[PDB]
Symmetry: C2
Amino acid sequence: DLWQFGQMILKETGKLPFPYYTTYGCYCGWGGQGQPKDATDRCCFVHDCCYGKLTACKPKTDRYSYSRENGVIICGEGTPCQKQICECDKAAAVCFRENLRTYLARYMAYPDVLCAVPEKC
Amino acid sequence: DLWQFGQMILKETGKLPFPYYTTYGCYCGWGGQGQPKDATDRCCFVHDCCYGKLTACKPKTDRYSYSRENGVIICGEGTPCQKQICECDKAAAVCFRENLRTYLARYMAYPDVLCAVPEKC
């Protein structure tokens, strides 16, 4: 569920989801209405697309099991939906971490008048 | 700034902004596009309206001073913008706390297809 996704984000990035990622750029911070501005912004686009493949699941409310082994998120046992939701959240949190060095604070609460139209998955 | 607003939210409600408030309802959780579903949702509407009165300020990046030693947020000294921003943030965090009694978990990640058109401040 979203709480677990937020725990992943904090653990991988060192930042709380609000405001560093929930307000970020033209996709993360504008309800997926704009073209992603950079790699961090695109992580949210991929995460939505990842959830979009789970048509028979409730990615926002289904609680899954996971642990950490050798610094890697290990999605544990559970329903097929639980494992697939976990893999979406893991991929996005690691994506945030991988792009910490191009993260721009001035993209937090970015003025959406300068955002461009968005593309599909 | 936004980091401080999030700290106020945690201190007043005992909940982190994500996901409990950033995904809530039709205004908080839908970028201000829908009409507020309940009192918690309306807190975000009033917060945006409060920021809109501060046309000479930068509510999202300006860092202000405040304390909460005795369970009440006290906005401290600073520029007029810093104090006005602080008061907007305090009022919204208190608004979340005072309406916890009617908070509905089912409004987290509410399906925006059932959100209605919103009003002006």
